[PDB]
Curated annotation (Swiss-Prot), chains A, B:
Site feature Binds to alpha-7/CHRNA7 AChR, where: 28, 35
Expression (tissue specificity): Expressed by the venom gland.
Post-translational changes noted in the entry: In homodimer alpha-cobratoxin, selective reduction of Cys(26)-Cys(30) in one subunit does not affect the activity against the alpha-7/CHRNA7 nAChR, whereas its reduction in both subunits almost prevents alpha-7/CHRNA7 nAChR recognition. On the contrary, reduction of one or both Cys(26)-Cys(30) disulfide bonds in the homodimer considerably potentiates inhibition of the alpha-3-beta-2/CHRNA3-CHRNB2 nAChR by the toxin.
Marked site positions, Binds to Torpedo AChR: 23, 49
Site (Binds to both neuronal alpha-7/CHRNA7 and Torpedo AChRs): 25, 27, 29, 33, 65
Organism of provenance: Naja kaouthia (Monocled cobra)
Subcellular location: Secreted
InterPro entries: Snake_3FTx, Snake_toxin-like_sf, Snake_toxin_con_site, Toxin_cobra-type
Protein name: Alpha-cobratoxin
Assembly: Monomer, homo- or heterodimer with cytotoxins 1 (P60305), 2 (AC P01445), and 3 (AC P01446); disulfide-linked.
Resulting phenotype, residue 65 to A: 7-fold decrease in affinity for Torpedo AChRs and 15-fold decrease in affinity for neuronal alpha-7/CHRNA7 AChR
């Protein structure tokens, strides 16, 4: 599987973990300047727990920087 | 917790499951006409498994129709 993963711009090939999990959360400066975002290759949709939002996909390729906020 | 959930437009209050999980996948008509989408209140980021993409949040309120595609 080809995990984009952070912080490292764009990339891939793990192989171990079989997925790409993406997640984001807010803080004082979100709104007027963008969200705090983390992109990675693990295995299982990682934990969320409390003021956060995330998504995951199988698809090697899919772990990029999402619609300016998630959307 | 207040799960929007599908198909039922917008709504909430489950309470059992403590979350809102959102997911989407494509088929022949995605591209030129939109993705196939499902929005719900369970408990745990539900399974994905194969040509699919999803996300989840704690946040009562959050389970709406995402950036025209996810983004």
């Amino acid at each position: 599987i080809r995990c984009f993963i952070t912080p490292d711009i764009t990339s891939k090939d793990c192989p171990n973990g079989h997925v790409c999990y993406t997640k984001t959360w807010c803080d004082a400066f979100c709104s007027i300047r963008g969200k705090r975002v983390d992109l990675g290759c693990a295995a299982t949709c990682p934990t969320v727990k409390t003021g956060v939002d995330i998504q995951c996909c199988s698809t090697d390729n899919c772990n990029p920087f999402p619609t300016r906020k998630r959307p």
